[PDB]
């Protein structure tokens, strides 16, 4: 049934820049040239990241917010299995090319958020033990909170654009192909 | 019932020029004097986009279709995105565009792969169906651009002379997997075929489906005992009718995966074609493989291998009919003229039962259906079989145009069939 | 942002960080401030932050009547810091006078609101507020609280420091009052599953119940805890705002009037709803060991004395 | 989330709320506090909060060396509020001496420490720090900032209040300096693009310039803005830490040694990455309106005078 989905195994470095948007979905923002994800031509830009694995492969745990991906990106050596979901319609990387990283931001004016409710803190500041949190955090970037926290505060706006310590100093692009022809085909399709 | 005849594979040379132009005058003049409704032409990918990913040469095709318009014959354009030519004999070869072939060579997983790694270059796989692998374009984008160029060039013909566009969605223009590699004699009739889903670009989706279903062992590969192409259904434990793996949970899961990927490939290309050819007085058709042999077996192993999840327990043509009804597409089916007794009985071939099942599915989904013969035959026996199958067909496509059909007795039989169907 | 928080004594040591933390909260829509002076300065300072919660200033009773017009949560940290050579008795008289005046004002302006008494000692100034509200005739026992979460926060910190647990995971409740030997940390009933030892009970108790004096001696008598007190008060305020918003899991260790014991007021884990004291958990006093039992006897004596002193002052 | 932050002078009006806010952060794991006195009390007060960020206190130049050992971000808000009747030049001298001492002690300890300078005047104290880093050969322009985020916060607040705009979306870039007249709010570069009339630009730029004086008048006798400074400095610390954590969306307005103009040091919106100033947004000085260009040209002489005061004091 979930045929838009696909599993890919990548050795570190992953070479993928992820984009946490104000929907809970962790997109793929850019791919480093010459990386393992660059070699694996199936990983596109805008494909949601649904599940992920650990260094030994372990169990293919679902990813809910930045908290799950933090552990994956902290590590530097291993083989990670990633489940990606191709968008129902092709991702308009036209917006990524045109709009600057400041344009596609959720907390542009970094409004402060001090909270003790664990249901508002992302799944790295919860501790999820008995009740609504024990310690409170004062944060300005909306990447430290859940979509419920963002709703309380209030292509979709992105709350963060994160990555890992990918070596090689490869340029962040959108895949190894005639990208100009790809965009021309995209406008031909939509028109 | 409208009658359509198909132009030979030499309708256009390697260069974009009409082959044997005076001969085509002779043939077409005889055809429209015979009262034939129309004619079916293969718009080849490798003769229009041969060397430039953007340049679309339409010389010979423009001559041919304007010429068919001049003789007042409807044109059924078949968007041939497949390679043909030397498989056992010589015939004539129309390869894929050279840049496409170069892309397939640099990345071998762009072509359908079997269990043992043999790669079929007749068509571009559906594992890389939406990946930008063809000079920065996805295969959907390439096919859509080809259809857009065809529409732009022949816009004055759509709705007036061109009345049907069959979409090439697999080998021989049939929405199927290349489970019959007659090349090098890898498969010979009768047989069951293999599972052409061993690209890693599709094994990725296999792993995704296996993880979604909570079975992190059913996505590693395909069946390990499915059987070689020329093996028999009872020779394989997967396709045996006595409680075989096709009835197990793993068999059901894998076969649903296979059929639904083929259906999703169909969905994508059909949606693209409908968007391109919307509201222009033309119809869109999809050709479906007429897998008559091994019909009597419970598993229907050739159908299972060629992407059709049609068994005695599941009707695999009903979802295809649903798709065609969703996109308002014509169901084109082969193997209409053949009879059960004519085909070998040791292989349990049931062409008439298969045609009946197709008709039932099309009636259930209210999908218009068209038929074509599988082999070229001029006999009144086959003509009467086609007449009965049409009586129960929106149109019929006849294979194949050749001077043999213009002989005395063959021509008389053909025209008799024409005014019998009319 | 549809609730109003007022701070009385907002220009003091606790008032400024407390007002800051209250302002940087999306649950707050308007934050009123009151002190004897410096209110205009603190309001001008805070009004430049880009958190969508307005800030207003007030001075004197004439502006206080306007300050408490539509408040939803009242916080009263208005206490005079200890002076070098000033008697604790008259210090209590002064602080109780401030608390009594502010409680009279809130009773006559908007009695239907949560009340968070911070001015030390709450053991004596919570009964004072209750009796003043009784005299005014608008006492609402469900909507009166004594902020005790400072000792809860200190207990969590000290437990996580003593045993190598996850600090954001630790949660231990505190029973009793808010000043002296009345702090009873329920280590044996802490939320994270642990295995304490008797020396750990002794050290944790003597540390948690003697933390205010620790801060005072660290400051060399300059003042009491200000930043931690503001943090704890903001914690309780956001809990109360969540309760006002309909949250069903607001379990806060507060010093409230409870019928679970002979003492009119007790500091226990309570459930807070839109109407205030929605329920009082009894299990906090079930399953205690003999250490908690003896310390609870001494705690009962101390709370009886403190509540009697507060009653004597109020009436 | 294992980054270390030191605050040198964390016992004043700004130091205490700033330390509280930085402790209550998800990124800081270690918090070092320094001041000449009254820092043990604040450290003990903060250590009772139940947040993972550990807190350590240091008193004296001898413990100053241990304070910044392996510190990822340094924040220097140390300063003296103006006493009643105090000489402006004398106050400038004390502030510059404190900044000189703190930066020269930072130099041998951790040059790569994203040095944040708060002590007013920013326009005169940032260049001082830059040259005291120059004499040590560790003057890296990518790792020295003057915190100008308070004016950005004030601009966001004032534009939101005046134009009735969603406070979560408004972002106003401010260039120039941190000395009142050297403030230039590039209102035409407001990210939620909104038209401003002549009268709306007027009184609004000037309140942005004079917010510090307004707060001083409101706080007559007691220093200047301190809660707003703590808030903005905590915002800058969080931005710097998350930039050091990756986060390729970190853009912030800071006062850095920029060759974007003739002035050696300038305030502008820069992109921050793991090594400091990843890039400088030069377009901040392209497309400016007539009023913005006139104000930019007017502030050059004042900013240059402040930088000249700084260089004279540092080379004295």
Coordinates of N, CA, C and O in Angstrom, one line a residue, chain A residues 75-185:
Chain A
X75 N 26.0 10.5 15.9 CA 27.0 9.5 15.5 C 27.7 9.9 14.2 O 27.2 10.7 13.4
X76 N 28.8 9.2 14.0 CA 29.7 9.5 12.9 C 30.1 8.3 12.1 O 30.6 8.5 11.0
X77 N 30.0 7.1 12.6 CA 30.5 5.9 12.0 C 29.4 4.8 12.0 O 28.8 4.6 13.1
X78 N 29.1 4.2 10.9 CA 28.2 3.1 10.9 C 27.4 3.1 9.6 O 27.6 3.9 8.7
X79 N 26.4 2.2 9.5 CA 25.5 2.0 8.4 C 24.1 2.2 8.9 O 23.7 1.5 9.8
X80 N 23.4 3.2 8.3 CA 22.1 3.6 8.7 C 21.1 3.3 7.7 O 21.3 3.5 6.5
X81 N 20.0 2.7 8.1 CA 18.9 2.4 7.2 C 17.8 3.4 7.3 O 17.3 3.7 8.4
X82 N 17.4 4.1 6.2 CA 16.5 5.2 6.2 C 15.3 4.9 5.3 O 15.5 4.4 4.2
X83 N 14.1 5.1 5.8 CA 12.9 5.0 5.1 C 12.5 6.4 4.6 O 12.2 7.2 5.5
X84 N 12.3 6.6 3.3 CA 11.9 7.9 2.8 C 10.6 7.7 2.1 O 10.3 6.6 1.5
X85 N 9.8 8.8 2.1 CA 8.5 8.8 1.4 C 8.5 9.8 0.3 O 8.7 11.0 0.6
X86 N 8.4 9.4 -0.9 CA 8.3 10.3 -2.0 C 7.0 11.1 -2.0 O 6.0 10.5 -1.7
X87 N 7.1 12.4 -2.2 CA 5.9 13.2 -2.1 C 4.9 12.8 -3.2 O 5.3 12.3 -4.2
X88 N 3.6 13.0 -2.9 CA 2.6 12.6 -3.9 C 2.7 13.3 -5.2 O 2.5 12.7 -6.2
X89 N 3.1 14.6 -5.1 CA 3.5 15.4 -6.3 C 4.9 15.8 -6.2 O 5.4 15.9 -5.1
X90 N 5.7 15.9 -7.3 CA 7.1 16.1 -7.2 C 7.4 17.4 -6.4 O 6.7 18.4 -6.6
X91 N 8.5 17.4 -5.6 CA 8.8 18.5 -4.8 C 9.2 19.7 -5.6 O 10.1 19.6 -6.4
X92 N 8.7 20.9 -5.4 CA 9.1 22.1 -6.1 C 10.4 22.6 -5.6 O 10.4 23.5 -4.7
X93 N 11.5 22.1 -6.0 CA 12.8 22.7 -5.6 C 13.0 24.0 -6.2 O 14.1 24.7 -6.0
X94 N 12.1 24.5 -7.0 CA 12.1 25.9 -7.5 C 12.1 26.8 -6.3 O 12.8 27.8 -6.3
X95 N 11.2 26.5 -5.3 CA 11.2 27.4 -4.1 C 12.5 27.3 -3.3 O 13.0 28.3 -2.8
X96 N 13.1 26.1 -3.3 CA 14.4 26.1 -2.6 C 15.5 26.9 -3.3 O 16.3 27.6 -2.7
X97 N 15.5 26.9 -4.7 CA 16.4 27.7 -5.4 C 16.1 29.2 -5.3 O 17.1 30.0 -5.1
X98 N 14.9 29.6 -5.3 CA 14.5 31.0 -5.3 C 14.6 31.6 -3.9 O 15.4 32.5 -3.6
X99 N 13.7 31.1 -3.0 CA 13.6 31.7 -1.7 C 14.9 31.4 -0.9 O 15.4 30.3 -0.9
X100 N 15.4 32.4 -0.2 CA 16.6 32.3 0.7 C 16.2 31.5 2.0 O 15.0 31.4 2.3
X101 N 17.2 31.1 2.7 CA 17.0 30.3 3.9 C 16.3 31.2 5.0 O 15.6 30.7 5.9
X102 N 16.5 32.5 4.9 CA 15.8 33.4 5.8 C 14.3 33.5 5.4 O 13.4 33.6 6.3
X103 N 14.0 33.5 4.1 CA 12.6 33.5 3.7 C 11.8 32.3 4.2 O 10.6 32.5 4.7
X104 N 12.4 31.1 4.2 CA 11.7 29.9 4.6 C 12.1 29.6 6.0 O 12.8 28.6 6.3
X105 N 11.6 30.5 6.9 CA 11.8 30.3 8.4 C 10.5 30.4 9.1 O 9.6 31.2 8.7
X106 N 10.4 29.7 10.2 CA 9.1 29.7 11.0 C 9.2 30.8 12.1 O 8.4 31.7 12.1
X107 N 10.2 30.7 13.0 CA 10.4 31.8 13.9 C 11.5 32.7 13.4 O 12.7 32.6 13.6
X108 N 11.0 33.7 12.6 CA 11.9 34.7 12.0 C 12.3 35.7 13.1 O 13.5 35.8 13.4
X109 N 11.3 36.4 13.7 CA 11.5 37.1 14.9 C 11.5 36.0 16.0 O 10.4 35.5 16.3
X110 N 12.7 35.8 16.6 CA 12.8 34.6 17.5 C 12.1 34.9 18.8 O 12.6 35.2 19.8
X111 N 10.7 34.7 18.7 CA 9.9 34.9 19.9 C 10.3 33.9 21.0 O 10.4 32.7 20.7
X112 N 10.4 34.3 22.2 CA 10.9 33.4 23.3 C 9.7 32.5 23.6 O 8.5 32.8 23.5
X113 N 10.1 31.3 24.1 CA 9.2 30.3 24.6 C 9.8 29.6 25.8 O 10.8 28.9 25.7
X114 N 9.2 29.9 27.0 CA 9.6 29.3 28.2 C 8.5 28.3 28.6 O 7.4 28.7 28.8
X115 N 8.9 27.1 28.8 CA 7.8 26.1 29.1 C 8.3 25.0 30.0 O 9.5 24.7 30.0
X116 N 7.4 24.4 30.8 CA 7.7 23.2 31.6 C 6.8 22.1 31.1 O 7.0 20.9 31.7
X117 N 5.9 22.2 30.2 CA 5.0 21.2 29.8 C 5.8 20.3 28.8 O 6.1 20.7 27.7
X118 N 6.0 19.0 29.2 CA 6.7 18.1 28.3 C 6.0 17.8 27.0 O 6.7 17.5 26.0
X119 N 4.7 18.0 27.0 CA 3.9 17.8 25.7 C 4.3 18.9 24.7 O 3.9 18.7 23.5
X120 N 4.9 20.0 25.1 CA 5.3 21.0 24.2 C 6.8 20.9 23.8 O 7.2 21.5 22.8
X121 N 7.6 20.2 24.5 CA 9.0 20.0 24.2 C 9.2 18.8 23.3 O 8.6 17.7 23.5
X122 N 10.1 19.0 22.3 CA 10.3 17.9 21.3 C 10.9 16.7 22.0 O 11.3 16.7 23.2
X123 N 11.0 15.5 21.3 CA 11.3 14.3 21.9 C 12.8 14.2 22.1 O 13.4 13.1 21.8
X124 N 13.4 15.2 22.7 CA 14.7 15.1 23.3 C 14.8 15.9 24.6 O 15.8 15.8 25.3
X125 N 13.7 16.6 25.0 CA 13.6 17.3 26.2 C 12.3 16.9 27.0 O 11.8 17.7 27.7
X126 N 11.8 15.7 26.8 CA 10.6 15.2 27.4 C 10.8 14.4 28.7 O 10.3 14.8 29.7
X127 N 11.5 13.3 28.6 CA 11.8 12.4 29.6 C 10.6 11.5 29.9 O 10.8 10.5 30.6
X128 N 9.5 11.9 29.4 CA 8.3 11.0 29.2 C 8.1 10.0 30.3 O 8.1 8.8 30.1
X129 N 8.0 10.4 31.6 CA 8.0 9.5 32.7 C 6.7 9.4 33.4 O 6.1 8.3 33.4
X130 N 6.2 10.5 34.0 CA 4.9 10.4 34.7 C 3.9 11.5 34.3 O 2.8 11.1 34.0
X131 N 4.4 12.7 34.2 CA 3.4 13.8 33.9 C 4.0 14.9 33.1 O 5.1 14.7 32.4
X132 N 3.4 16.1 33.1 CA 3.8 17.2 32.2 C 5.1 17.9 32.6 O 5.1 19.0 33.0
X133 N 6.2 17.1 32.5 CA 7.5 17.7 32.6 C 7.9 18.1 34.0 O 7.1 18.3 34.9
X134 N 9.2 18.2 34.2 CA 9.8 18.6 35.5 C 10.6 19.9 35.4 O 10.5 20.7 36.3
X135 N 11.4 20.0 34.3 CA 12.2 21.2 34.1 C 11.7 22.0 32.9 O 11.1 21.4 32.0
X136 N 11.9 23.3 33.0 CA 11.5 24.2 31.9 C 12.6 24.7 31.1 O 13.7 24.9 31.7
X137 N 12.4 25.0 29.9 CA 13.4 25.5 28.9 C 12.9 26.8 28.4 O 11.7 27.0 28.1
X138 N 13.9 27.7 28.2 CA 13.7 29.0 27.5 C 14.4 28.9 26.2 O 15.6 29.0 26.1
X139 N 13.6 28.8 25.1 CA 14.2 28.6 23.8 C 13.6 29.7 22.8 O 12.5 30.1 23.0
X140 N 14.4 30.1 21.8 CA 14.0 31.0 20.8 C 13.8 30.4 19.4 O 12.9 30.9 18.7
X141 N 14.5 29.4 19.1 CA 14.3 28.7 17.8 C 13.1 27.7 18.1 O 13.1 27.0 19.1
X142 N 12.2 27.6 17.1 CA 11.0 26.8 17.2 C 11.4 25.3 16.9 O 10.5 24.5 16.8
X143 N 12.7 25.0 16.8 CA 13.1 23.6 16.5 C 13.1 22.7 17.8 O 13.2 21.5 17.6
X144 N 13.0 23.3 19.0 CA 13.0 22.6 20.2 C 11.7 22.2 20.7 O 11.6 21.7 21.8
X145 N 10.6 22.4 19.9 CA 9.3 22.2 20.4 C 8.5 21.3 19.4 O 8.9 21.2 18.3
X146 N 7.4 20.8 19.9 CA 6.5 19.9 19.1 C 5.5 20.8 18.3 O 5.4 22.0 18.5
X147 N 4.9 20.2 17.3 CA 3.9 20.9 16.5 C 2.8 21.5 17.4 O 2.2 22.6 17.1
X148 N 2.5 20.9 18.5 CA 1.5 21.5 19.5 C 2.1 22.7 20.1 O 1.4 23.7 20.3
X149 N 3.4 22.7 20.4 CA 4.0 24.0 20.9 C 4.0 25.1 19.8 O 3.8 26.2 20.1
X150 N 4.3 24.7 18.5 CA 4.2 25.7 17.5 C 2.8 26.2 17.3 O 2.6 27.4 17.1
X151 N 1.8 25.4 17.4 CA 0.4 25.8 17.4 C 0.1 26.8 18.5 O -0.7 27.8 18.3
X152 N 0.6 26.5 19.7 CA 0.4 27.4 20.8 C 1.1 28.7 20.5 O 0.5 29.8 20.9
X153 N 2.2 28.7 19.9 CA 2.9 29.9 19.5 C 2.1 30.7 18.6 O 2.0 32.0 18.7
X154 N 1.4 30.1 17.6 CA 0.5 30.8 16.7 C -0.7 31.2 17.4 O -1.2 32.3 17.3
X155 N 5.2 24.9 -0.2 CA 6.0 24.4 0.8 C 5.8 25.1 2.2 O 5.8 26.3 2.2
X156 N 5.6 24.3 3.2 CA 5.4 24.9 4.5 C 6.6 25.5 5.1 O 7.7 25.1 4.7
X157 N 6.5 26.5 5.9 CA 7.7 27.1 6.5 C 8.5 26.1 7.3 O 8.0 25.2 8.0
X158 N 9.8 26.3 7.2 CA 10.8 25.3 7.9 C 11.2 25.9 9.2 O 11.6 27.1 9.3
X159 N 11.1 25.1 10.3 CA 11.5 25.5 11.6 C 13.0 25.3 11.8 O 13.6 26.0 12.7
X160 N 13.7 24.5 11.1 CA 15.1 24.3 11.2 C 15.6 23.6 9.9 O 14.9 22.9 9.2
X161 N 16.9 23.8 9.6 CA 17.6 23.2 8.5 C 18.9 22.7 9.1 O 19.9 23.4 9.3
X162 N 18.9 21.4 9.5 CA 20.0 20.8 10.2 C 20.8 19.8 9.4 O 20.3 19.4 8.3
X163 N 21.9 19.4 9.9 CA 22.8 18.4 9.2 C 23.7 17.7 10.2 O 23.5 17.8 11.4
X164 N 24.7 17.0 9.7 CA 25.7 16.4 10.6 C 27.1 16.8 10.1 O 27.3 17.7 9.2
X165 N 28.1 16.2 10.7 CA 29.5 16.6 10.4 C 30.1 15.9 9.2 O 31.2 15.3 9.2
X166 N 29.4 16.0 8.0 CA 29.8 15.4 6.8 C 31.1 15.9 6.3 O 31.2 17.1 6.1
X167 N 32.1 15.1 6.1 CA 33.4 15.6 5.6 C 33.5 15.7 4.1 O 32.5 15.4 3.4
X168 N 34.6 16.0 3.6 CA 34.9 16.1 2.2 C 34.7 17.4 1.6 O 35.1 17.7 0.4
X169 N 34.0 18.3 2.3 CA 33.8 19.7 1.8 C 33.1 19.7 0.5 O 33.3 20.6 -0.4
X170 N 32.1 18.8 0.3 CA 31.4 18.8 -1.0 C 30.3 19.8 -1.0 O 29.6 20.1 0.1
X171 N 30.0 20.4 -2.1 CA 29.0 21.4 -2.3 C 27.6 20.8 -2.1 O 27.4 19.7 -2.5
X172 N 26.8 21.6 -1.4 CA 25.4 21.2 -1.2 C 24.6 21.5 -2.4 O 24.3 22.6 -2.7
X173 N 24.2 20.4 -3.2 CA 23.4 20.6 -4.3 C 22.1 19.8 -4.3 O 21.6 19.4 -3.2
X174 N 21.5 19.5 -5.4 CA 20.2 18.9 -5.5 C 20.3 17.6 -6.3 O 19.2 17.1 -6.8
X175 N 21.4 16.9 -6.4 CA 21.6 15.7 -7.1 C 22.5 15.9 -8.3 O 22.6 17.0 -8.9
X176 N 23.1 14.7 -8.8 CA 24.0 14.8 -9.9 C 23.2 14.5 -11.2 O 23.1 13.4 -11.7
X177 N 22.7 15.6 -11.8 CA 22.0 15.5 -13.1 C 21.9 16.9 -13.6 O 22.2 17.9 -12.9
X178 N 21.5 17.1 -14.9 CA 21.3 18.4 -15.5 C 20.1 19.1 -14.8 O 19.0 19.1 -15.3
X179 N 20.4 19.7 -13.7 CA 19.4 20.3 -12.8 C 18.6 21.4 -13.6 O 17.4 21.5 -13.4
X180 N 19.2 22.1 -14.5 CA 18.5 23.1 -15.3 C 17.4 22.4 -16.2 O 16.3 22.9 -16.2
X181 N 17.8 21.3 -16.8 CA 16.8 20.5 -17.6 C 15.7 19.9 -16.7 O 14.6 19.9 -17.1
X182 N 16.1 19.5 -15.4 CA 15.1 19.0 -14.5 C 14.1 20.1 -14.2 O 12.8 19.8 -14.2
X183 N 14.5 21.3 -13.9 CA 13.5 22.4 -13.6 C 12.7 22.7 -14.9 O 11.5 23.0 -14.8
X184 N 13.4 22.7 -16.1 CA 12.6 23.0 -17.3 C 11.5 22.0 -17.5 O 10.4 22.3 -17.8
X185 N 11.8 20.7 -17.2 CA 10.8 19.7 -17.3 C 9.7 19.9 -16.3 O 8.6 19.6 -16.5

